[PDB]
């Protein structure tokens, strides 16, 4: 349960968080587009 | 401090930034009613 | 490199990714604003 392993666990969560946020950004950007 | 602390600080900063961007996209959704 | 280096490098990349998303978000903020 080293600090290393704990941070590797946290980075896995960050990859997940970024995945969904990216997709949501893309969805809103597509919806609205340019004028 | 230390090399490991610098890393922990960056991981904290990452979690913070992500939360901020989540919040931002939430506010954008309100502006467009989505 | 080392276990520790490899994690350091993944964190930098994640900071790169977050900067990019911040800019995409900022762009969308302009797209849904008044013009």
From Swiss-Prot, chains A, C:
Disruption phenotype: Abolishes recruitment of the mediator complex to the upstream activating sequence (UAS) of amino-acid starvation responsive genes. Decreases RNA level of genes involved in amino acid biosynthesis and cofactor biosynthesis during amino acid starvation or methyl methanesulfonate stress. Growth dependent on amino acid supplementation. Sensitive to amino acid starvation. Sensitive to purine starvation. Decreases cellular glycogen levels during glucose starvation.
Induction data: Translation is induced by amino acid or purine starvation, or during growth in low or poor carbon sources. Translational repression during nutrient-rich conditions is dependent on four uORFs (upstream open reading frames) present in the 5'-UTR of the mRNA; these promote ribosome dissociation. Translational induction occurs in conditions reducing translation machinery efficiency, leading to ribosomes scanning over the uORFs, and increased translation of the mRNA. The rapid translational induction is followed by transcriptional induction at later time-points, independently of the uORF sequences.
Post-translational modification: Phosphorylated by the cyclin-CDK PCL5-PHO85.
Compartmental location: Nucleus
Chain positions covered by the region annotation Leucine-zipper: 7-28
Recorded superkingdom: Eukaryota
Family: Belongs to the bZIP family. GCN4 subfamily.
Role description: Master transcriptional regulator that mediates the response to amino acid starvation. Binds variations of the DNA sequence 5'-ATGA[CG]TCAT-3' in canonical nucleosome-depleted 5'-positioned promoters, and also within coding sequences and 3' non-coding regions. During nutrient starvation (low or poor amino acid, carbon or purine sources), it activates genes required for amino acid biosynthesis and transport, autophagy, cofactor biosynthesis and transport, mitochondrial transport, and additional downstream transcription factors.
Quaternary data: Homodimer. Each subunit binds overlapping and non-identical half-sites that flank the central CG base-pair in the pseudo-palindromic motif 5'-ATGA[CG]TCAT-3'. Interacts with the mediator tail; the interaction with GAL11/MED15 is direct. Interacts with the SAGA histone acetyltransferase complex. Interacts with the SWI/SNF chromatin remodeling complex.
This protein's domain notes: Residues 89 to 100 and 106 to 125 define the N-terminal activation domain (NTAD) and the central acidic activation domain (CAAD) respectively, which can function independently to promote high-level transcription of the target genes.
Official protein name in the record: General control transcription factor GCN4
The organism of origin for this protein: Saccharomyces cerevisiae (strain ATCC 204508 / S288c)
Lineage: Eukaryota, Fungi, Dikarya, Ascomycota, Saccharomycotina
GN (gene name): GCN4
Range of the intact protein held here: 249 to 281 of 281
């Amino acid at each position: 349960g080293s600090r290393m392993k704990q941070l590797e666990d946290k980075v896995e969560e960050l990859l997940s968080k970024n995945y969904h946020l990216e997709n949501e950004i893309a969805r809103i950007k597509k919806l609205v587009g340019e004028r």
